[PDB]
Coordinates of C-alpha atoms in Angstrom, one line a residue:
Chain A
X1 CA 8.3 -21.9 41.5
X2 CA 10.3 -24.4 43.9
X3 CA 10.5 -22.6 46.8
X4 CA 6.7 -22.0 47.3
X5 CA 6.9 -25.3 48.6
X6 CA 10.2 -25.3 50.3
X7 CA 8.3 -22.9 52.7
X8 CA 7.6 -26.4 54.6
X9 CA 11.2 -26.4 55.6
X10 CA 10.5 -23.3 58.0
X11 CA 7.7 -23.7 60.3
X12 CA 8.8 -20.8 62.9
X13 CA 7.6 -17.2 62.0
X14 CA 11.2 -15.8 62.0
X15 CA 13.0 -18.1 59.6
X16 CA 10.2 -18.0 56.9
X17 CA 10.2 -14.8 57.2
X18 CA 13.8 -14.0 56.9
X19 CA 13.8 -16.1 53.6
X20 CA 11.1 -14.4 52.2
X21 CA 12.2 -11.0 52.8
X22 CA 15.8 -12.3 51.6
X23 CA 15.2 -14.3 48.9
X24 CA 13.2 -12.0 46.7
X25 CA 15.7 -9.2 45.5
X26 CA 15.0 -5.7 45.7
X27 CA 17.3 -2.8 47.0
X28 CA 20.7 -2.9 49.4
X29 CA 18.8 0.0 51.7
X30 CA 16.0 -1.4 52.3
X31 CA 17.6 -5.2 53.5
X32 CA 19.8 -3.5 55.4
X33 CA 17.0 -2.0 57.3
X34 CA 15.5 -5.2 58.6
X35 CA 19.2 -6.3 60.3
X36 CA 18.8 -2.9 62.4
X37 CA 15.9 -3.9 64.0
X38 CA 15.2 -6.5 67.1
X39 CA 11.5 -6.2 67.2
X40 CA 9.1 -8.7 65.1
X41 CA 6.0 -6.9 64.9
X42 CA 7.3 -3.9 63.7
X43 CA 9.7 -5.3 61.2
X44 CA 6.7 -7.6 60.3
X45 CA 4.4 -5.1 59.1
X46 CA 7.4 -3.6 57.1
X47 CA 7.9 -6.4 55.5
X48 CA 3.9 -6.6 54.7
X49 CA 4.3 -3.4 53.9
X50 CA 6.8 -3.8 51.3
X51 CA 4.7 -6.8 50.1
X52 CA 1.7 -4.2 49.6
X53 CA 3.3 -1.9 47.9
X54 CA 6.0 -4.1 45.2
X55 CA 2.2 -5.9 44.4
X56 CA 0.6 -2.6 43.6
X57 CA 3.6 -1.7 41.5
X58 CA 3.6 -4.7 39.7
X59 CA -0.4 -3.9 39.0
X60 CA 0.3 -0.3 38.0
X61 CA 3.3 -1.5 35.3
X62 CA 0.8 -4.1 34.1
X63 CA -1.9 -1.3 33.2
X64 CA 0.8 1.0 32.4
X65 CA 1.7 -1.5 29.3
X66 CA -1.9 -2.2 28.4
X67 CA -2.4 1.1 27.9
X68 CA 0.6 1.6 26.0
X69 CA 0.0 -1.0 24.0
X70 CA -3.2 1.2 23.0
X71 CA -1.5 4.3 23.0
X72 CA 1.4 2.7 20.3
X73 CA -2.2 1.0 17.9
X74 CA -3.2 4.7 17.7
X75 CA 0.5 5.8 16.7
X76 CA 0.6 3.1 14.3
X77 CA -3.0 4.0 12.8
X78 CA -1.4 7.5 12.5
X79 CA 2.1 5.9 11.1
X80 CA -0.5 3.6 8.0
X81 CA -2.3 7.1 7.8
X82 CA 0.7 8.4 6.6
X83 CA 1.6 5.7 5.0
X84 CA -1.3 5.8 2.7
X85 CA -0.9 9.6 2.0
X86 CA 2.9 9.0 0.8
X87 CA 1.9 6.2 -1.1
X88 CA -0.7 8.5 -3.3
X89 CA 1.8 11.6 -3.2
X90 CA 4.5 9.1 -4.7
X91 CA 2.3 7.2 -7.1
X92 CA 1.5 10.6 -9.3
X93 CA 5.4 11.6 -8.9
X94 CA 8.3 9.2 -7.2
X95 CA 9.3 11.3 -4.1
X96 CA 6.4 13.6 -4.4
X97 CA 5.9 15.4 -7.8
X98 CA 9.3 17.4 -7.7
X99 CA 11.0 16.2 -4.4
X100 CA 10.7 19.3 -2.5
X101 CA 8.9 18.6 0.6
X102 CA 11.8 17.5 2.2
X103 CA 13.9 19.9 1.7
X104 CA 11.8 22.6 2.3
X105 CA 11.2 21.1 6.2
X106 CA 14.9 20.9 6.7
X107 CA 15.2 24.2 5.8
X108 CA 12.5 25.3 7.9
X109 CA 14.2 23.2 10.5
X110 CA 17.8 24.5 9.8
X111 CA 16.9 28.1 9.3
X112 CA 16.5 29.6 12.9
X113 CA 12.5 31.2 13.1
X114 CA 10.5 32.1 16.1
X115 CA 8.8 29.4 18.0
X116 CA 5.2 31.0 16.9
X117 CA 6.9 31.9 13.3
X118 CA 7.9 27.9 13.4
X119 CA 3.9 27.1 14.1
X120 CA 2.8 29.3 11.2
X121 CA 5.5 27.3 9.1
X122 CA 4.5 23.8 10.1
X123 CA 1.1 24.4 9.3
X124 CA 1.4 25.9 6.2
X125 CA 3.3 23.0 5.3
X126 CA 0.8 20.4 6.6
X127 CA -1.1 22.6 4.5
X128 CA 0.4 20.8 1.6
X129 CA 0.9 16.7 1.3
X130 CA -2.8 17.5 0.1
X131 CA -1.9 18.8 -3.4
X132 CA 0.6 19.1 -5.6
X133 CA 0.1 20.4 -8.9
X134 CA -2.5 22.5 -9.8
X135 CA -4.5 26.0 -9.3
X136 CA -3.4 27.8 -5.7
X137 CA -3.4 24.8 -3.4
X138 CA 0.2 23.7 -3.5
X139 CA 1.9 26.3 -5.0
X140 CA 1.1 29.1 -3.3
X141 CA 2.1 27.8 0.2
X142 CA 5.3 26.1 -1.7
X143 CA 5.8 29.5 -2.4
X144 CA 5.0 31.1 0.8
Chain B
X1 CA 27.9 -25.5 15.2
X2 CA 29.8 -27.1 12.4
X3 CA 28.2 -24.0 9.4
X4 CA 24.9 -26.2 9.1
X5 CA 23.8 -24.5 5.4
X6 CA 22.1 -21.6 6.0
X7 CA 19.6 -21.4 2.8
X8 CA 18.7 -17.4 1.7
X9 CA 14.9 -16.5 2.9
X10 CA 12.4 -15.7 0.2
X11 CA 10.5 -13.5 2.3
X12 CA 9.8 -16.6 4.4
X13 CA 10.0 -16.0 8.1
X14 CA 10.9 -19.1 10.3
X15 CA 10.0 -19.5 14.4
X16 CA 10.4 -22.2 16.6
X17 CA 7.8 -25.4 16.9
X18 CA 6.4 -24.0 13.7
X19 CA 6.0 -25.7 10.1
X20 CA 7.6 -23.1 7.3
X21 CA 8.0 -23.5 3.7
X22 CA 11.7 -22.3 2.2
X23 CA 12.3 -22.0 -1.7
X24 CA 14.7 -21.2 -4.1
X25 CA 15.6 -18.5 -7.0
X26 CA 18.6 -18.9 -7.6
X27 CA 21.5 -21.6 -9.1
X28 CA 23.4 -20.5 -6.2
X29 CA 20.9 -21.9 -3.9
X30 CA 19.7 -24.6 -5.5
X31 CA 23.2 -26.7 -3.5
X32 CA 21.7 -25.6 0.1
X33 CA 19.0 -28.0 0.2
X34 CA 21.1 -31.4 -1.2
X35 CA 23.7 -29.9 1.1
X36 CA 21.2 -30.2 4.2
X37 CA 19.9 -33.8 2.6
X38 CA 23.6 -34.8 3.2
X39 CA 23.8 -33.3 6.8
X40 CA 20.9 -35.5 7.6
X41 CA 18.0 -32.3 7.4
X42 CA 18.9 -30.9 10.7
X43 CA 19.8 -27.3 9.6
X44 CA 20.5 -23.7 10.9
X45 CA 18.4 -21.2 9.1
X46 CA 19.4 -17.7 9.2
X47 CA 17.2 -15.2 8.3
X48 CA 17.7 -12.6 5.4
X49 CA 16.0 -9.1 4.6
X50 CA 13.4 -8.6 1.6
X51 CA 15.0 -9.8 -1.8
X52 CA 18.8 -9.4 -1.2
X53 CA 21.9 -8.9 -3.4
X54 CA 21.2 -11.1 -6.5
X55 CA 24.2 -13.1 -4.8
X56 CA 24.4 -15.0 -1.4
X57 CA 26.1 -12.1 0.7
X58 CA 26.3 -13.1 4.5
X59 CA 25.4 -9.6 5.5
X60 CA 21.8 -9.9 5.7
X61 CA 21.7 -12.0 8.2
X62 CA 21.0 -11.5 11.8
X63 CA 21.7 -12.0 15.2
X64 CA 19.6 -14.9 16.0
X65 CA 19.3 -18.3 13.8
X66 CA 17.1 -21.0 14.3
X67 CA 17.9 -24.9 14.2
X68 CA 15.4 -26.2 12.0
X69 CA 14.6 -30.6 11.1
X70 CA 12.7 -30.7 7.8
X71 CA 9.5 -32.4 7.9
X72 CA 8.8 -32.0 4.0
X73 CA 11.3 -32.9 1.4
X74 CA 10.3 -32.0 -2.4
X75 CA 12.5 -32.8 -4.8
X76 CA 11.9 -30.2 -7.6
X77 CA 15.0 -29.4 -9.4
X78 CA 13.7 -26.6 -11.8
X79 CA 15.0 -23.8 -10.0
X80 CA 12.8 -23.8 -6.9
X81 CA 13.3 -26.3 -4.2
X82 CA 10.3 -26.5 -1.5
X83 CA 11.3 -28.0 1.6
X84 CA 9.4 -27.5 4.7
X85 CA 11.4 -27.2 8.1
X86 CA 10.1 -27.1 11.7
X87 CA 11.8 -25.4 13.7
X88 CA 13.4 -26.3 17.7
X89 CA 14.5 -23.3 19.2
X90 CA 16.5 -20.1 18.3
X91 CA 20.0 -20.0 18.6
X92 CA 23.2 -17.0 18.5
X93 CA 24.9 -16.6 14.8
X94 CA 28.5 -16.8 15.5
X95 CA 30.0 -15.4 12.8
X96 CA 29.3 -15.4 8.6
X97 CA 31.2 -17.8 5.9
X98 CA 31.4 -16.1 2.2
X99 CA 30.1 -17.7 -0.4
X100 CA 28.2 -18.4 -2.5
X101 CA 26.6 -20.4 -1.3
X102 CA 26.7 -18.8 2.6
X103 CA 27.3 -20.6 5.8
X104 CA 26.8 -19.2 9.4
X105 CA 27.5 -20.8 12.8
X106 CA 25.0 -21.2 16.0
X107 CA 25.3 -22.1 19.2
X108 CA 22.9 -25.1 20.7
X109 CA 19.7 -25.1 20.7
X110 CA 17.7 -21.8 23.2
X111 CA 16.8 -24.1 25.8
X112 CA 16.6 -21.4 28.3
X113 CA 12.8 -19.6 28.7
X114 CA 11.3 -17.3 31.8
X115 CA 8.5 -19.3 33.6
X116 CA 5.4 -18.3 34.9
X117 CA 4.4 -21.0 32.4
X118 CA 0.3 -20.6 33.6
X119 CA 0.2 -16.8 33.0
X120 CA 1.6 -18.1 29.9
X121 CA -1.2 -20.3 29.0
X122 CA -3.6 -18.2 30.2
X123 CA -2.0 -15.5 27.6
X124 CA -2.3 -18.8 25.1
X125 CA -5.6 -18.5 25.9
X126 CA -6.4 -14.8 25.4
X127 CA -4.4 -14.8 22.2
X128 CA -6.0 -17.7 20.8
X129 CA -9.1 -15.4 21.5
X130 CA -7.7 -12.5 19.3
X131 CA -6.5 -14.3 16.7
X132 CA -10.4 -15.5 16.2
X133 CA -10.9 -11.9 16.2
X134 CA -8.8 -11.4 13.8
X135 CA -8.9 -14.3 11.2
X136 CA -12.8 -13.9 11.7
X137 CA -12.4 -10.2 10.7
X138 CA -9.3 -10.9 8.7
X139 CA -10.7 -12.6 5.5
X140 CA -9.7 -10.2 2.7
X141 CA -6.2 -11.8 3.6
X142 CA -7.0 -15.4 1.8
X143 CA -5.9 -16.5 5.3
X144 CA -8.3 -20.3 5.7
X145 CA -9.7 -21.5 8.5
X146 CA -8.1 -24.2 8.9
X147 CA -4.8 -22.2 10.3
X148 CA -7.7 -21.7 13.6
X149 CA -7.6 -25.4 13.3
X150 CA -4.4 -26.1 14.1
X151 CA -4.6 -24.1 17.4
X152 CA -6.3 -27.3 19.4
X153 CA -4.1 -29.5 21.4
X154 CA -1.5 -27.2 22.0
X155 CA 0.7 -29.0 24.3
X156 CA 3.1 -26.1 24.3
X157 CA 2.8 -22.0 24.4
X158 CA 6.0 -21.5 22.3
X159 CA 4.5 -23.4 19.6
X160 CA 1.2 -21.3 19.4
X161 CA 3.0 -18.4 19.8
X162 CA 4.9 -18.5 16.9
X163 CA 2.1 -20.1 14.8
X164 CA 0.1 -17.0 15.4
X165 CA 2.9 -14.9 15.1
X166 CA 3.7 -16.4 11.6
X167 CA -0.2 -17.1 10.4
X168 CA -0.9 -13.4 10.7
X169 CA 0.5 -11.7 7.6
X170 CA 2.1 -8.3 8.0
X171 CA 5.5 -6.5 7.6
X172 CA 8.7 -9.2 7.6
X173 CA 10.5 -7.0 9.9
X174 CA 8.0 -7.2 13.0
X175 CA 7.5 -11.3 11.9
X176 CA 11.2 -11.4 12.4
X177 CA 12.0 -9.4 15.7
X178 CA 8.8 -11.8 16.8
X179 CA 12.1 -14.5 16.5
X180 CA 15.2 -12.3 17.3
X181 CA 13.6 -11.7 21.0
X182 CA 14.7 -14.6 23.1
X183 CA 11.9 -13.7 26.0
X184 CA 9.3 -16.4 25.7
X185 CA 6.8 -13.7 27.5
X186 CA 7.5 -10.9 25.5
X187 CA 6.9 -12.3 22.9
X188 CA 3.3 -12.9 23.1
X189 CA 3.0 -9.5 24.2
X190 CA 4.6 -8.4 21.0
X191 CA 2.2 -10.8 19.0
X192 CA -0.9 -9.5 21.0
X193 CA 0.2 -6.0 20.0
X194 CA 0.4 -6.7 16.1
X195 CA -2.6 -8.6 15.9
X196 CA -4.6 -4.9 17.6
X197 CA -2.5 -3.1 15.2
X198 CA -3.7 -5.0 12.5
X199 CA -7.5 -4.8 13.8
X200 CA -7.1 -0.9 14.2
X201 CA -5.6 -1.1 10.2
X202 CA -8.3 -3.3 9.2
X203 CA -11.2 -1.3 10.8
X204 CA -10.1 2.4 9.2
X205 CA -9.5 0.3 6.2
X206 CA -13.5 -0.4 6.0
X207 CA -14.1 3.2 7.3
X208 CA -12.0 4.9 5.2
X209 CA -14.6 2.8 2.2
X210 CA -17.4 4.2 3.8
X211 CA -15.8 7.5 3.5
X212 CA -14.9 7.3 0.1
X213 CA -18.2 6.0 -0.8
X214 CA -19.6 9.3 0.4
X215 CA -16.9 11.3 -1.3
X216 CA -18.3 9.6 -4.7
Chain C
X1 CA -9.4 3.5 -18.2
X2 CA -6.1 6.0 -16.5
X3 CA -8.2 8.5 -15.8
X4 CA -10.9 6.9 -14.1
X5 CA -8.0 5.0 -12.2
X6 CA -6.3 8.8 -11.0
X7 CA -9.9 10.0 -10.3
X8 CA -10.6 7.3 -7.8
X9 CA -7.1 7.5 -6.2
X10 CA -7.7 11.5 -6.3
X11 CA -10.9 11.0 -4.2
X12 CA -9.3 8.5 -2.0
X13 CA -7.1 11.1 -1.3
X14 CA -9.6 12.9 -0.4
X15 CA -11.6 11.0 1.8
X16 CA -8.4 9.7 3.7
X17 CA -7.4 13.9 3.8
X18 CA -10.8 14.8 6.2
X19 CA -9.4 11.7 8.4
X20 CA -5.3 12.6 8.5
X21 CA -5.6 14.0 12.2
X22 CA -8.0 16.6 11.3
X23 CA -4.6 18.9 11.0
X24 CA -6.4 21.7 8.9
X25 CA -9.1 21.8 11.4
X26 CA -9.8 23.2 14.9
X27 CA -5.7 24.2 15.1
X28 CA -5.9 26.8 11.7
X29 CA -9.6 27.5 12.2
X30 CA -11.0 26.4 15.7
X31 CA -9.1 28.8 17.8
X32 CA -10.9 31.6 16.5
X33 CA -13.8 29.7 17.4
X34 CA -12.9 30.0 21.2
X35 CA -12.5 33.8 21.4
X36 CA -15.7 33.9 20.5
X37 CA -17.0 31.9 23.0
X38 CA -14.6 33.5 25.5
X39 CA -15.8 37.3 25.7
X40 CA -18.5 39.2 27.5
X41 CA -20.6 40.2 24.5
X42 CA -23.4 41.9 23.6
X43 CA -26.0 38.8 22.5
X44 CA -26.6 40.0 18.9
X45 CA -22.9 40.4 18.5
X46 CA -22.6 36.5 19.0
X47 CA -25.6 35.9 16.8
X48 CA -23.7 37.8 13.9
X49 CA -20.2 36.4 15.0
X50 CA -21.9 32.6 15.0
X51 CA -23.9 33.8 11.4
X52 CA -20.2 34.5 9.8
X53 CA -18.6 31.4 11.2
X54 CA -21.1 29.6 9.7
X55 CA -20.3 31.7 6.3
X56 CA -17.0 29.6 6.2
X57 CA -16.3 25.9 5.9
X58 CA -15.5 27.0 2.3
X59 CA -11.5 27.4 1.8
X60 CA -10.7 30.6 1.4
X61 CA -7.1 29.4 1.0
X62 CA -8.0 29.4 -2.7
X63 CA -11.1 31.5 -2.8
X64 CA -10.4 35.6 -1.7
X65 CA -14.3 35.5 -0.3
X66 CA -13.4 34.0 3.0
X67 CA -10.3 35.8 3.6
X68 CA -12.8 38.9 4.5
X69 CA -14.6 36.2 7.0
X70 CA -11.4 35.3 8.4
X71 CA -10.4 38.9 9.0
X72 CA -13.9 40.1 10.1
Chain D
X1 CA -24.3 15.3 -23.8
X2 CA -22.1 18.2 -24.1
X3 CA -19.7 17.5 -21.3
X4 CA -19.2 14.1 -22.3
X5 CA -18.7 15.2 -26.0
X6 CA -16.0 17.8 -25.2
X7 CA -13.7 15.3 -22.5
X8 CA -14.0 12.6 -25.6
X9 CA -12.7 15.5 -27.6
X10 CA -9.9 16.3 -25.3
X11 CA -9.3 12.8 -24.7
X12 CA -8.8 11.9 -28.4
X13 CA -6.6 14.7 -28.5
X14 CA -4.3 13.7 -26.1
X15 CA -4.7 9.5 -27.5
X16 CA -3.8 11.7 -31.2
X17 CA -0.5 12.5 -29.9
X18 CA 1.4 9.8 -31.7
X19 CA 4.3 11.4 -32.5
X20 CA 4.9 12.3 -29.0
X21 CA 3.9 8.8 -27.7
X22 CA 7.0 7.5 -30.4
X23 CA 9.5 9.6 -29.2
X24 CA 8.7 8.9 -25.5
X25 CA 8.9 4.8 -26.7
X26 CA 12.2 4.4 -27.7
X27 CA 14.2 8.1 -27.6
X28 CA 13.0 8.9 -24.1
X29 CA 14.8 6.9 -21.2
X30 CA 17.1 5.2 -23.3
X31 CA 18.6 7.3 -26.0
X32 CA 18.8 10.0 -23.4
X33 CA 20.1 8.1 -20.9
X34 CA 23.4 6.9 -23.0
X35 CA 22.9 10.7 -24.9
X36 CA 24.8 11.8 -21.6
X37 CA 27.8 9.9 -22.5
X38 CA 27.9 10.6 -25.6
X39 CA 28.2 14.5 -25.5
X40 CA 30.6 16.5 -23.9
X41 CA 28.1 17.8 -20.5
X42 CA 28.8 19.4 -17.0
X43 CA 29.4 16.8 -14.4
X44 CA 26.5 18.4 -12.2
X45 CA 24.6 19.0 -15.6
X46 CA 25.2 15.0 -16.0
X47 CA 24.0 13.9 -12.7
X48 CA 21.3 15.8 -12.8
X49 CA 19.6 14.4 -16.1
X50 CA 20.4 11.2 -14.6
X51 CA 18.0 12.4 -11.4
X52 CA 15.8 13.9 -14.6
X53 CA 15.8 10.2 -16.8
X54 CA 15.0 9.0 -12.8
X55 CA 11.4 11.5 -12.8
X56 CA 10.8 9.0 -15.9
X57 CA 9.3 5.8 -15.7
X58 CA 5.9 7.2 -15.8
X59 CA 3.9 8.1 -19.2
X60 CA 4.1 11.8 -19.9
X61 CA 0.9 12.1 -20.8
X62 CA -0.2 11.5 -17.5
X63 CA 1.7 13.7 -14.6
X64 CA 2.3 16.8 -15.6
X65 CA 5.5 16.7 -13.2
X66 CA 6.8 14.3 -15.7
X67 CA 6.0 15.4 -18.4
X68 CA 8.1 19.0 -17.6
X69 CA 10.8 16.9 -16.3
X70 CA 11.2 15.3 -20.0
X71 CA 11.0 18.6 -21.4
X72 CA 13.7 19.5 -18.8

């Protein structure tokens, strides 16, 4: 923040501009650009130009994070939602009641199915994580 | 520098400009802080995982350090010394002596920051403003008031930073990467983050009573 | 004292279940629901497609007298 | 009245189970666990009741999951 003040060492429009354009980094194309031109009003409102648009950016990335930084609450509201369910599937049996869950998605997983055969398959086994031990609510889907 | 003792974390999570309590549990331990009384208090503490091999093993700790001058000295030898350390800055662990007890080395203190120091008091600002949300909201955590107290006169935004980031209980592994990132900015945003996710986890919390109300 | 304990947990299971995403609903059940609402029909076909949709909301993935609904 | 009546029944019943509560005391999770050593077993066979002494922990009374495990 030094050289907003150091702008009092240029008082011409070409040398403060130069330094501005120069001494805020951005790609070897566009710098090179400027050097092939000899006229100042053109050149000036690429620079402006330039200025426009790296500010808009900057806004864009700066909403672009804020609404990540909703979108990852929600993922982590999901990820505690989870977290609770595990908790209550573990406290009846460590693991779930006989540690099969697991394996049974890797299997579904590692045994090659049909894209619409693999949606059938993970919804019969989001089917489960809801019971696990008695009359058909578990058992039957473990089965199917 | 010179393996300043590095005592083993008790689920205790340490950041810069920021008072933190440190026991013991352990005999092995118990030499760490008379160790740090000889090297005139001015420590580098290390930070270790959730309760770690019942023997000092200088594999749990981590990237970052921070140099630490305790504030609060009790002398309580019955197996659990309290001494309180404030932190200076963060600081790169060299390398890991075996013990026990375990030593580490650091480098000077992280004197080196991004600026933009207004947007980050104006961020200060904002997440003094969600950590009133959340404390106010936050009272099934035995958290007291007097930790929104403490966030007046802040002559520094590193300082509050890390005071929110450590006041606000959750998970030791997000309390800790709040320390291991060496962006001052980024840190807050990080903070600001945990403190919504917390709020989000709060409010289904009280709707998920609701709902099981109505289930009864 | 245990079983009270389990009961509770059982319907916080429950109650946390009818908020895990809604994954049972609308991507099981729902879709059906669209083909209805999709297809030039006669009106008293709708009224007795929309009087067996509102039949189910029982599961008939442990009770046979909603597999029929499903299939009709 | 009645309902009340017949889960105190079933609950005394299962509180009535002493003998069961005395082996699962001592014998279970301990004798067991050094019984593995102290018979000729399979090495699978050995690991495996060490997983099965793991699904203990819990009263087997309570989760039927355990309680077949101990019978396993």
């Amino acid at each position: 923040r030094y050289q907003l003040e150091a702008v009092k060492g240029t008082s011409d429009p070409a040398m403060l501009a130069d330094t501005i354009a120069y001494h805020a980094t951005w790609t070897v194309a566009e710098k090179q650009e400027i050097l092939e031109l000899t006229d100042l009003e053109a050149r000036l409102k690429k620079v402006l130009g330039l200025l426009s648009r790296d500010l808009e950016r900057f806004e864009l990335d700066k909403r672009v994070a804020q609404r990540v930084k909703e979108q990852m609450d929600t993922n982590q509201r999901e990820y505690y939602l989870r977290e609770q369910m595990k908790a209550i599937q573990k406290e009846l049996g460590g693991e779930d009641g006989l540690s099969d869950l697991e394996a049974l998605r890797k299997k579904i997983e590692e045994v090659g199915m049909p894209e619409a055969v693999k949606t059938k398959a993970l919804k019969e086994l989001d089917r489960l994580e809801r019971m696990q031990q008695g009359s058909p609510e578990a058992t039957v889907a473990r089965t199917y | 520098r010179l393996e300043l003792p590095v005592i083993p974390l008790r689920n205790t999570v340490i950041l810069p400009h920021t008072t933190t309590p440190v026991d013991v549990g352990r005999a092995k331990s118990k030499r760490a802080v008379e160790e740090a009384m000889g090297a005139d208090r001015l420590i580098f503490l290390v930070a270790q995982r959730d309760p770690e091999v019942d023997d000092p093993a200088p594999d749990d700790l981590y990237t970052w350090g921070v140099q630490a001058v305790v504030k609060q000295a009790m002398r309580l030898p019955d197996g659990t010394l309290q001494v309180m350390v404030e932190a200076r800055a963060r600081a790169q662990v060299t390398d890991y002596i075996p013990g026990p007890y375990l030593r580490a080395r650091g480098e000077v203190f992280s004197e080196i920051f991004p600026i933009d120091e207004a947007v980050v008091r104006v961020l200060v600002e904002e997440l003094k403003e969600a950590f009133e949300k959340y404390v106010a909201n936050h009272k099934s955590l035995r958290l007291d008031r007097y930790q929104l107290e403490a966030v007046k006169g802040t002559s520094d935004p590193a300082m509050l930073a890390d005071t929110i980031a450590y006041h606000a209980t959750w998970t030791v592994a997000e309390k800790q990467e709040i320390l291991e990132l060496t962006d001052l900015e980024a840190r807050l945003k990080k903070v600001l983050g945990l403190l919504s996710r917390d709020l989000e986890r709060f409010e289904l919390d009280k709707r998920v009573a609701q709902r099981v109300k109505e289930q009864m």
